[PDB]
Amino acid sequence: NLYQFKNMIQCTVPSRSWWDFADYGCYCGRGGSGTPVDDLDRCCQVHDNCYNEAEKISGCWPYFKTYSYECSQGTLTCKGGNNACAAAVCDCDRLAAICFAGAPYNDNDYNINLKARC
């Protein structure tokens, strides 16, 4: 679930507030479309797409499905107790939080005019 996702982000990107990614580029935040403005934005678009896939497993709502996972200094793994849904969205979140850490954050890409650039 989203609360867990932001803890995942905390695990991989220690001194950037999770809120910094809530309105970035064309895809970081609720929804997204157009052309990713950078590598960070692109992490979000495959995350979004990853969520789109997990939803195709019916009764699976990526936003609210809680899962089991573990943070061990910069790394993440999903753990036991996950049903098909939890396993899939946990994997989505893991890969996205891992992606965020290896992409530069460009302030110029935060809270952009979606209308103009996307």
Would you list which residues are annotated within the binding site for Ca(2+)? 27, 29, 31, 48
H or E stretch at 75: strand 75-78
Measured at the alpha carbon of residue 43, what is the angle toward residues 41 and 48, in degrees to the nearest 5?
Answer: 95
User: Tokens at residue 6, please?
Assistant: 């932001």
Q: Which residue is catalytic, options 20, 93, 107, 109? A: 93
- Residue 52 contact partner, candidates ligand GEL, Ca ion, its own copies, none, CB within 5 to 8 A by sort of partner: ligand GEL
When binding is defined by CB under 8 A, the residue of 33, 35, 49, 111 that contacts its own copies is 35
Q: Does 115 bind its own copies (CB under 8 A)?
A: no
- Maximum Cα–Cα distance across the chain: 44
Residue 93 catalytic? yes
State how far the Cα of 7 lies from the Cα of 57, in Å rounded to an integer.
Answer: 24
Residue 31 sits in the site that holds its own copies (CB under 8 A): no
Among 6, 29, 38, 39, binds Ca ion (CB under 5 A): 29
